[PDB]
Symmetry: D2
Subunit: 386 residues, 4 copies
């Protein structure tokens, strides 16, 4: 009954089930969880692995000695459970030093510090077997117009990512980077606010092949955009390196609900696309169990993330395999969208009278697209009402 196994590739950040519940208006409602306990509990629920920021695993300001100890305990829990660590990232947002950003802070000394803190964590990530390193520039941006010259800030962001690519290349590491967009919060406006802006930026880096995107469901929804459409553009460009799955109720603060909550129809269309395109990376959940819950509620919320992905996978698969759906797709001319407009070439098109001079515009205009019938078949499949 929709039971996950390690083969489903479900992963969770330590900071997700570990969120203590502090919000802008309230204190923590839960005690801190030791990373070793989260690894054990997630493994029991059927997860494949975990991810971390540097500061989630090793407390900020730890001595080299303390650092080694934290790593050793963690590595033991991974060995004990068979859990993997497919991705890691850096915290460049919590400490006060990063109040104006890491890579794009106005202060040059802070920008050099941000790069060194990042490089230290890349080494660790490689040691633990991570294949992807995420960068979320949560403090890169502004609340007022004069505070940041965006052209100069993009020069600084490019400079930072180029240096990181030179580092991994020089070291011979087998790791790629994934930039995660967000439109706002905590800054009034954040740089590279959507998947489009991040894809465009990557094309100006020195070694574009090393970088892709890590889109998050609720971030594109904070700009009112269609998440499945954004993922289709990332897949088309060959840059979907990783993904963050969760839920969000429209344009408001970043909610990070469990996957399946928020926009359920968009969750269905997202699973349909990931499974049809054969995405083979981790299915990572970046969510927060609400602060109303105790520890029992935390694990119920984490289990619900995986259950909803499995129900949606079954329903999308039943939709695509139904002969009545296959017929409706041809009725709506999805087969014709997939054929070239003019494989015959420019000259042939220019010489074709059926394309203009003798094209019957009124007859073509009267043809219904039959999209409502197709969408109701999709609704019936989602609801298990066939």
């Amino acid at each position: 009954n929709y039971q996950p196994t390690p083969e489903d590739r479900f992963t969770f950040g330590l900071w997700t089930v570990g969120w203590q519940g502090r919000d802008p208006f309230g204190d923590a409602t839960r005690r801190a969880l030791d990373p070793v306990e989260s690894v054990r509990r997630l493994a029991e629920l059927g997860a494949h692995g975990v991810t971390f920021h540097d500061d989630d695993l090793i407390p900020f300001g730890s001595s080299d000695s303390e650092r080694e100890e934290h790593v050793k305990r963690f590595r033991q829990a991974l060995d004990d459970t068979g859990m993997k660590v497919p991705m890691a990232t850096t915290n460049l947002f919590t400490h006060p030093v990063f109040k104006d950003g890491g890579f794009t802070a106005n202060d040059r000394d802070v920008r050099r510090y941000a790069l060194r803190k990042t490089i230290r964590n890349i080494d660790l990530a490689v040691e633990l077997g991570a294949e992807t390193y995420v960068a979320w520039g949560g403090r890169e941006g502004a609340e007022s117009g004069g505070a940041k010259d965006v052209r100069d800030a993009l020069d600084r962001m490019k400079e930072a990512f180029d240096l990181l690519g030179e580092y991994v290349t020089s070291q011979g590491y087998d790791i790629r980077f994934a930039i995660e967009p967000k439109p706002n919060e905590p800054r009034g406006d954040i740089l590279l606010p959507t998947v489009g802006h991040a894809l465009a930026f990557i094309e100006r880096l020195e070694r574009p092949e090393l970088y892709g995107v890590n889109p998050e469901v609720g971030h594109e929804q904070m700009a009112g955009l269609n998440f499945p459409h954004g993922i289709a553009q990332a897949l088309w460009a060959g840059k979907l390196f990783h993904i963050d799955l969760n839920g969000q109720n429209g344009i408001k603060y970043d909610q990070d609900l469990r996957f399946g909550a928020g926009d359920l129809r968009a969750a269905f269309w997202l699973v349909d696309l990931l499974e049809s395109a054969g995405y083979s990376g981790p299915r990572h959940f970046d969510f927060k169990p609400p602060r109303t819950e105790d520890f029992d509620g935390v694990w119920a919320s984490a289990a619900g993330c995986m259950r909803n992905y499995l129900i949606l996978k079954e329903r999308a698969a039943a939709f695509r395999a139904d002969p009545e759906v296959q017929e409706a797709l041809r009725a709506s001319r999805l087969d014709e969208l997939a054929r070239p407009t003019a494989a015959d070439g420019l000259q042939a098109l220019l010489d074709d009278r059926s394309a203009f001079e003798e094209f019957d515009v009124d007859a073509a205009a009267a043809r219904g697209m039959a999209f409502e019938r197709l969408d109701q078949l999709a609704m019936d499949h989602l609801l298990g009402a066939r």
Copy 2:
């Protein structure tokens, strides 16, 4: 007193002052304007030129004879006034045949028709001296998830733009293309919804040098994004080929208010950036005088567009030239944002103990950015309260 002249490069679409006032819930409140009359009235107000869709100038379905007549009258009005035509575009959205799109309609025959209608208008545009040809794919998108496979639609969009580039190259024309994003309306979701998504798409075309963006103030604001930030990214990429100026009150239907209405502070920061970066293209207004107005109100609204740009230009210039502002910019370390993080190189950075091992994080964190004082200087300059 803020009087425009042709040297200010202010331009208007025929469809702007020519909007009859039909909305989703109401009939037209104004009679149609002849294009010749709009050219004469705009020239009297101090505009530099006009732009058009094919269908604004030559009524859809016109015979070759009628076509020649419409063009001749128009060319006479331009000669009589000294007005120029710096940009043109195609209507691929009004006729019912385009109900599912032009370049990405599911029906192949419609896609071939859309290309031929476009090519016919490129020839005309060149004849009239246009330097830029805009493409707004207002019907490219969907209301439901199964109706459009986005990967296949992006293949079709790329195919169309590649054919257009082959056409202009083969003809030896001196014209470039500018894609105009919009997130929604009239389709539920439109493809290439923001400037970021359009910039990323251009990088996959066969001759990327031929294509840039035509951002519009109110479109990026329909996704809650910061317009000046989006323009800074387009300038950084070298792709700001043209711009549409107007006003919008937040996330709602596309209002197309006169420039200066809507978000006034964002209008100030936009003018500051265009003038500092030395943008030298047209200052084009894509607006609609509200349907509450008669013809006197139409021309007052058009004049207000140009007046507000001129007031904002004066205030931004006074801001940048004030010694007290120059001092506040250094207080907030804008000068340091413009210097390279590590011109010394990767190895030097790795060997620099002042960047990590001996960096005083607490001292750097305590330094205030002085952004509020800078922003209040900007407020005082905008309001003429210095």
Copy 3:
């Protein structure tokens, strides 16, 4: 298999299935439907009745003779099918005369005209057996701040509704009014923008008992609000006189999708509430079949409205009847929310040491609410995954 019957009380506006597909950027894609044909087709699908604006039934500017003829044909179709007319309303938005509003236009003569046009239609509505008369003030509002003094406009709106109440009272009619809010579109801002603002306004009318609200799903969603919460407040006040059901994808133009599309989880919670509270009015659909469809698509979309309500009714009923859900509701203390806080009275509360002096705040704070488990039970029931 989810087949509607007249007993389900499903109703449709003539303007819904009759929408020709004209949008702000495009011409009509469908021919006009005769009202008699819509009555017959809806009756075959299992609807209970239809509603109309004056102008949908009798073309604007019709002579008394033509008026009688249109009514007679309509009455014949109702008799032939057994369809009823439970609600009617007035068009005070399409004609150019209403460009600044009907009841709150600045011009006094227009305000008197709007009242007379309304009264003429109340008489007709009563003749046809309507129990509710809706008022949607789509043109009451503004695009700019100086154009409308809102205090004076609310005086004018109150004056209009008071006169309407005096009219129905004097005539001895058995009809009540329902005001329908909308936040924007077609005006930049519309007066009484949400259900809250309309409920508050009703309390200042001379005979408040005669007026309630007609909320619409997508209108409250255009302000990012929770529709089921707004309906619960209207039910609490005893003012849910009628409802408009449809779908909307977030904050954007008014989409009017078929019911069940848009926010599916909010559709589930809405049906749960209407059925639990025993709402007994019509289940009216105010939707537009997308302009991509032909007539076959129109009727498929209308049938889908009713099907989705019936599937959701079954799932909400299965949720409330499940013993495991009843247990989870007690686990989350929904039973305690329904008990008075202090039936003992103020003095007893003040004297109760267990309420303050000896209340163990830490013990109460540690109690989890178990909301995630409850919400996953609701997800499983919606998906038919129990």
Copy 4:
């Protein structure tokens, strides 16, 4: 030069300039300020008074002894400076016990606790001379649909406010309540989300005369609504008891920028209305100096709040006094909006042929409203460009 004095009635919450800068993603960037220091610094800048939550003044869990000491020091600073305390409120949101709400928590014991904590603070407020007591129910709401039955929660909210009214009446206090709406954050949806919903709720309380609203600029803007329109409805109902002034950039997290930032045109129209209507309550700022600033930046931000109100007051006054504006108001028929539609009565209206039978609809429709010219006069006055 726009220097405030105590006579301008400018007030600030202790929590405003006292915000340490902790956000959902970061630690505090400033040290805590002693309330005595904030009183002294605000008095030097020209403020009239301060406001507080119970927990801002007396640390949660303080003994009666400690409580008396905190109050005494505060009262000394007020006496030393001449500052007043016009409003106070309760913190029912920070402590973990309030995770599901105060007045509407599902747990009955928590609801009784919330009432006692509130009553204790009403006594203190009266002692300090407050005239208004604000209630912001920031935790009253939900993240999921089954967690809260809204009808039962509104019964509980009414019960709480009724008990509070019985308390003040029994004690003979001269204090009134003001409910402050917010649509979301920290809960997914908050109950009474806008000024409309709060006004409607007040009408169902036992002694409605004791309660009004405390609207906040950025809260109504989080729902995309027009703030000046909402304030006009509150003034029309006679319920504008207090106001919170700040700035917000559209639909996103609650920014609490300084007043004048965010939507500057809406700030202009708000000042115009408060000054024209003769609002005589405090001009209270509920803002947060951004976490990028040090203490110098905090006081610059607070001073900017008052400066911007004074500049806007001057510009709105110059607008209303300009003869050319007075003429444009008559051109747009604002004078006619203020006259009754039908002082003649219902029968006279029904008998008036000029209102229907002989009304020339086409002539009335052709009359332009001249709103664009009026709005450009308002723009010129705001910018000091007359």
